[PDB]
Design a protein around this ligand. Structure first.
Ligand SMILES: O=c1[nH]c(=O)c2[nH]c(=O)[nH]c2[nH]1
Length: 530
């Protein structure tokens, strides 16, 4: 802490780091809501000879309107729209006669689209669903692709955590940037759906790596007074990423060009990312004085602190480290106070992700334009984050986290009690819910990054990220369980965050302790707590 005070805590370096990493987080959000947009399902119909063959119109003596041909070729499906997956195969000319009931056909007259589909290009010129036939039998495979992505971020977090702790944050972040950029462009140009799925998997490895290493490096270089503000800026990075996604997708509506446009900035980001400084503190806790000295001298020179360059001799630093000198997940899970801290963090992360996907359903009731909906999500997410930052600065982290989860759960229960016809009240509760989940995200990121000591912190944050992805993955099975009664999903969506807030109330008070660097340090606050 005194070394950081010597090097300073409100200089140009932290400002540039915050801006550059917030922009990079914005682009990771663009990748995630790229996956929210690619494979949107347009209205579809069977391919029909009489419709999509100039010779078949020239063989018809006369003229029929396109609406009449559509009625004559494809039955109306659910919601008075054309049936998406069925055709009559031959034109039912009696249906033009007004003396015909709509039931003058048999189930034997319908067959699946065996010869494929004609896709509407009015909104989107091309999507993976129209190109790769992700309709009918593969409609459920779409949630499988989302499931693969979320499993990829989970396993990536579980693997990249210990790797980041072993090799350092700057190196793993840089390698994550390279892997994400290359694999994302390869995913954009993939010939087959399994190859796309593989590239999405390897991209998800790097999204998890980037998120962890940006948060980690930010905590290690920011003075304690500025840490909430800087990560709040990062969470606004998520909201601005949503808004940027909406803007780019509105401007570029072909998925290949959109994916390429979203992947190129991470190559440019990597190019400036070689300049990024590694965490001095992490280098410091592992020893290796000469390399830590070199990094401190470089950052001091970049920060304009040459008067600190002339001071700080190795004898003084060795004297200051003599007192400080005087791993596997199983180590994290075997000592009770960090087992307990990890378990509560992991449960709260699980509750976060699960509450997120569940709450997001409501957003569909407000209207239709997906671009406008994403923009409105970002715009509403921003002031909630600002309020979260002020509450985190005044009251501290634990009461704010508990209040945010309690508000979320009470909001979900109120959504359970609101009639479906009163859609405006449902919308209002949905907006309050989304604000609460965003505030909870900022709380969980601050409290999880601050709760664990540096040597095991990355392993614990990785396991937490695994828990959030576990909630997200467990989600679709609870929506498929939703068939077993309308009250079960809402009951689960209400019970999980209330229980998580109650568990979050079972945490040790923070905001006035020095950050723990070693496991031995952790015992000293516990004795003080006892
Ligand atoms: O960066 C993310 N972390 C998550 O845990 C999560 N869950 C979800 O649905 N989307 C995202 N995005």
């Amino acid at each position: 802490s005194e070394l950081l005070d010597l090097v300073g805590g409100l200089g140009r370096f932290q400002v540039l780091q915050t801006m550059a990493l917030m922009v990079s987080i914005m682009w990771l959000c663009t990748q995630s809501m790229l996956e929210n947009f690619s494979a949107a399902v347009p209205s579809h119909r069977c391919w029909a000879p009489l419709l999509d063959n100039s010779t078949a119109q020239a063989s018809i003596l006369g003229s029929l309107s396109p609406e009449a041909l559509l009625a004559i070729s494809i039955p109306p499906g659910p919601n008075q729209r054309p049936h998406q997956c069925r055709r009559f195969r031959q034109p039912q000319w009696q249906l033009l006669d007004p003396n015909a009931t709509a039931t003058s056909w048999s189930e034997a007259d319908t067959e699946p689209c065996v010869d494929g589909w004609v896709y509407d290009r009015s909104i989107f010129t091309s999507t993976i669903v129209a190109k790769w036939n992700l309709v009918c039998d593969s409609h459920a495979l779409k949630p499988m692709a989302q499931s693969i992505y979320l499993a990829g971020i989970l396993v990536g977090a579980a693997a990249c955590g210990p790797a980041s702790d072993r090799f350092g944050r700057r190196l793993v972040l840089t390698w994550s940037y390279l892997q994400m950029a290359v694999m994302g462009t390869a995913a954009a140009f993939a010939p087959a759906f399994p190859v796309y799925c593989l590239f999405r998997f390897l991209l998800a490895f790097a999204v998890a790596g980037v998120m962890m290493n940006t948060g980690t490096l930010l905590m290690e270089w920011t003075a304690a007074r500025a840490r909430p503000l800087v990560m709040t800026l990062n969470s606004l990075g998520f909201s601005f990423g949503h808004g940027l996604t909406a803007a780019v997708a509105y401007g570029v509506r072909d998925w290949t060009l959109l994916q390429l446009v979203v992947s190129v900035p991470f190559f440019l980001c990597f190019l400036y990312s070689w300049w990024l400084a590694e965490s001095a503190r992490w280098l410091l806790t592992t020893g290796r004085l000469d390399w830590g000295l070199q990094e401190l001298w470089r950052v001091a020179a970049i920060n304009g602190k040459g008067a600190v360059q002339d001071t700080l001799t190795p004898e003084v630093l060795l004297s200051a480290m003599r007192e400080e000198l005087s791993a596997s997940l199983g180590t994290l899970l075997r000592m009770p106070g960090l087992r307990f801290r990890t378990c509560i963090s992991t449960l709260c992360w699980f509750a976060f992700g699960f509450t997120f996907f569940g709450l997001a359903l409501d957003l569909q009731a407000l209207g239709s334009n997906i671009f406008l909906l994403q923009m409105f999500i970002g715009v509403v997410d921003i002031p909630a984050k600002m309020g979260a930052l002020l509450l985190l600065s005044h009251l501290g982290r634990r009461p704010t986290l508990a209040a945010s989860l309690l508000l979320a759960g009470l909001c979900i229960l109120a959504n359970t009690l609101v009639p479906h016809e009163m859609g405006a009240l449902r919308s209002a509760l949905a907006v309050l819910g989304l604000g609460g989940v965003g505030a909870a995200f900022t709380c969980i990121t601050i409290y999880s990054s601050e709760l664990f000591p540096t040597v095991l912190r990355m392993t614990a944050v990785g396991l937490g990220q695994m828990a959030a992805s576990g909630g997200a993955i467990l989600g679709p099975l609870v929506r498929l369980l939703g068939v077993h009664g309308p009250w079960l999903p809402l009951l689960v969506y209400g019970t999980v965050p209330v229980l998580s807030g109650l568990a979050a109330l079972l945490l040790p008070e923070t905001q006035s302790l020095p950050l723990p660097d070693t496991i031995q340090d952790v015992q000293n606050q516990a004795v003080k707590k006892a």
